[PDB]
Curated annotation (Swiss-Prot):
GO biological process: 'de novo' protein folding; amyloid fibril formation; heart morphogenesis; heart trabecula formation; negative regulation of activin receptor signaling pathway; negative regulation of transforming growth factor beta receptor signaling pathway; positive regulation of canonical NF-kappaB signal transduction; protein folding
Function, in words: Keeps in an inactive conformation TGFBR1, the TGF-beta type I serine/threonine kinase receptor, preventing TGF-beta receptor activation in absence of ligand. Recruits SMAD7 to ACVR1B which prevents the association of SMAD2 and SMAD3 with the activin receptor complex, thereby blocking the activin signal. May modulate the RYR1 calcium channel activity. PPIases accelerate the folding of proteins. It catalyzes the cis-trans isomerization of proline imidic peptide bonds in oligopeptides.
Entry-annotated residues carrying N6-acetyllysine: 53
Protein name according to UniProt: Peptidyl-prolyl cis-trans isomerase FKBP1A
Species of provenance: Homo sapiens
Catalytic EC class: isomerase
């Protein structure tokens, strides 16, 4: 599968990220069992990435593009849109489905 977007709280319903814009988000990443492996909130610093530059996994590129500014949403991402068969040594296992809690704070 790809990425499933499930809303948590609504944004403005009008402003969606376009390619080349910088997305400013807070996020929490969990394995399918619910174990947290990464979180910008624990660092108290939002995470920024430019859409369309492949600085993030494909599930983020296609999932955050479907969010409006101010929205919080749950992204469920299958391994092909994620870290794949390889996974990531010591953090992400092989063939992992990942769940992200993502809040799109603003676009720059």
């Amino acid at each position: 599968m790809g990425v499933q977007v499930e809303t948590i709280s609504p944004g403005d319903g009008r402003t969606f990220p376009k390619r080349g814009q910088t997305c400013v988000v807070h996020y929490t990443g969990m394995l399918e069992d619910g174990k947290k492996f990464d979180s910008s909130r624990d660092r108290n610093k939002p995470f920024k990435f430019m859409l369309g530059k492949q600085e993030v996994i494909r599930g983020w590129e296609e999932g955050v593009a479907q969010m409006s500014v101010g929205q919080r949403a749950k992204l469920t991402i299958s391994p092909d849109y994620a870290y794949g068969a390889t996974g990531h040594p010591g953090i992400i296992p092989p063939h992992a489905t990942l769940v992200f809690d993502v809040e799109l704070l603003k676009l720059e």
